[PDB]
Design a protein around this ligand. Structure first.
Ligand SMILES: Nc1ncnc2c1ncn2[C@@H]1O[C@H](COP(=O)(O)O)[C@@H](OP(=O)(O)O)[C@H]1O
Ligand SMILES: Nc1ncnc2c1ncn2[C@@H]1O[C@H](COP(=O)(O)O)[C@@H](OP(=O)(O)O)[C@H]1O
Ligand SMILES: C=C/C(C)=C/C=C/C(C)=C/C=C1/C(C)=CCCC1(C)C
Ligand SMILES: C=C/C(C)=C/C=C/C(C)=C/C=C1/C(C)=CCCC1(C)C
Ligand code: EMC
Ligand code: EMC
Ligand SMILES: [Ca+2]
Ligand SMILES: [Ca+2]
Lengths: 344, 344
């Protein structure tokens, strides 16, 4: 089908210099993709044309976001709602209930030898499990979707911009997109990078923040990602939510999601769903916390997939100079647009 | 203690007219200092009596050269050998491992305002770091030296001749001194003057060669400088080496340095050390290439601190007339004296 309208470019000397300083140890390298220069991992290229042209189905539900914005929460909510609050069945791994469309791009099979070198103890891994993970990461995302039979509802996870996917997809599919204060996404993302060993242990959050707001982290530029989803926010098949609202009004956001998915929830059902997403409960939920991975040996001490679950904790990481920089960056990107974060 | 025995003179209308045509744009002016007429940036005067009288220490090691003769290599070899080949600890910046005795002199704080005018793009300066550099450059060398505590070994870099430093210093301290073919020193120096923006964009190598062999560039007259180190060549505490030898027999030179500093390196330790001074490897060594300065905004496009790393390349810059002129100049300073270069 349709030709892939995008070129890619390597990073120039300065961009390369910066990324290499913070993510250099990590074997997978980046490429800037399309006219907005979205950072993708190089393995993304083999499947770029396939995702653009992926066959979609009227029962597909997508959960989208720049990473670390509230995907996991939403996924759980959306899945339970569509599955008639069947909690019992929701106990299987998220990873097995959703397809992670663009999760594949992080691993380059040409460099299999290199990824355990990033771990403190390569000699502790569970190799049956770890090699299974590497094999799964090898299958492009488009194949995983396609694999799913038409009598099974597809639940899709993705951190992809809309312009890397079929345009007019919202003609066919429903999507919930999450956004979140960039400054908090920066901190969450920094830690997540620490979690998987994506970042050089000698780098610090400032460094990360540089890479981030300047548009040289995974799937940035940040505001372009969000701006795409914001511009389709009134489409009956699109639902634009802020992480912060989950904290302010969890009952209220649930009711919105059910309304979106064409479902009636009774006050109590929403309440039961509200208790379910309680941070401490969720955090110690085996089905959603990827603590299955820790057993494998690929998660760092200290870090966790479900971390603190608060809004505004960026003030704890940003210094005076950093705080001004962020204010000018958010100021410039919200100039001449109606996008507002309810927090600020 | 001890009065500074040297007088200083302004340049005459002649000398001035020439210097002025080649380096006029650069704020700092020169003075000829002492009976041999060493060119020194005016700001050198305020510290000259102090360097001449500076307290010295048994464990002090000095690396000395007329600039662009192989200081940087020598510093790295000496540093590593002294620190029991701890290649890790040497990953800090050379600037922080050595104190550049006379580095201060190129900046006159009275003309702070004038130094960013010489840049193509002053508006892209990193002010914090650039003002940081200016400030550091205002500290007399003698003071930086004095501040190193007695139980830290003092590594000194300098381009001063011996007569401007304590007489009899070689009773107390070791010095490695590097000499190099003047014609190559001229070319490296021309490019170096280009790197920092010292030289007028409209001047060329010929104009520069005029200044240099005539005794009207930084720290010339060239031959008087070398001759000084050469007469102390047999002193137990002086090690006179030629740049050309580092290319001819690097292992051989590393062994000589090693022995000078009092170490018995094994064949292999010398190998490890030579691989380390591999030109491409050195050039890309963040700790010695000064490319950290490029992000500040103070180096020129085109130029690099570690450039070509080759002997005999002056034949590419000298014309017929310049070559002969040079043949005559070199012969005249080597008349009645046992100083010979390996190259010629
Ligand atoms: N039930 C919940 N309630 C509130 N926040 C949750 C949550 N489950 C996960 N989170 C948080 O959402 C962020 C991850 O979002 P995503 O799923 O898009 O990666 C993590 O943020 P923090 O790192 O800021 O704590 C995490 O702690
Ligand atoms: N590892 C190395 N091997 C050979 N030459 C080196 C080197 N590191 C620096 N140099 C060279 O030594 C010269 C500078 O000397 P100094 O360190 O005293 O400034 C420069 O010469 P060229 O400009 O001729 O290339 C430079 O390229
Ligand atoms: C939103 C982010 C999530 C859930 C990220 C996790 C991603 C995965 C599956 C990472 C996996 C890896 C795997 C499976 C193997 C080697 C390295 C690496 C750490 C890149
Ligand atoms: C052998 C020469 C070396 C390594 C020279 C480096 C010199 C320095 C410290 C140069 C710095 C400058 C600084 C810091 C500021 C304004 C102008 C100027 C170019 C004179
Ligand atoms: C601003 C409270 Hg985390
Ligand atoms: C002798 C030519 Hg570099
Ligand atoms: Ca390995
Ligand atoms: Ca100015």
């Amino acid at each position: 089908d349709l030709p892939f309208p995008y070129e890619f470019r390597e990073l120039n000397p300065e961009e390369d210099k910066l990324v290499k300083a913070n993510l250099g140890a990590f074997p997978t390298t980046y490429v800037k993709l399309g006219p907005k220069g979205y950072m993708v991992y190089r393995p993304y290229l083999k499947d770029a044309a396939n995702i653009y042209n992926m066959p979609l189905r009227p029962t597909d539900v997508f959960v989208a976001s720049y990473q670390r914005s509230g995907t996991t929460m939403t996924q759980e909510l959306v899945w339970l709602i569509e599955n008639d609050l069947n909690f019992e069945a929701a106990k299987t791994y998220m990873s097995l209930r959703y397809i992670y469309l663009d999760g594949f791009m992080i691993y380059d099979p040409e460099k299999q030898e290199e990824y355990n070198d990033i771990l403190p103890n390569p000699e502790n891994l569970d190799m049956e499990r770890y090699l299974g993970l590497l094999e799964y990461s090898s299958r492009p995302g488009s194949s995983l979707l396609a694999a799913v039979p038409p009598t099974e509802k597809r639940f899709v996870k993705t951190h992809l911009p809309l312009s890397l996917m079929p345009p007019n997809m919202l003609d066919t599919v429903k999507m919930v997109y999450l956004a979140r204060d960039p400054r908090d996404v920066a901190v969450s993302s920094f830690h997540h990078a620490r979690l998987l060993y994506l970042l050089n242990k000698q780098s610090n959050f400032k460094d990360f923040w540089e890479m981030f707001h300047r548009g040289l982290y995974t799937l940035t530029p940040y505001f372009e990602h969000v701006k795409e989803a914001w511009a389709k926010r009134h489409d009956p098949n699109m639902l634009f939510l802020f992480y912060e609202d989950y904290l302010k009004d969890l009952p209220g956001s649930i009711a919105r999601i059910a309304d979106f998915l064409g479902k009636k929830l009774s006050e109590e059902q929403i309440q039961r769903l509200s208790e379910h997403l309680n941070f401490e409960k969720f955090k110690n939920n085996g089905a959603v916390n990827m603590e299955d991975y820790r057993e494998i040996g690929i998660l760092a001490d200290g870090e966790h997939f479900i971390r603190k679950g608060k809004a505004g904790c960026w003030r704890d990481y940003f210094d005076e100079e950093m705080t001004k920089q962020a204010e000018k960056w958010i100021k410039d990107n919200l100039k001449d647009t109606d996008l507002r974060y309810p927090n600020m």
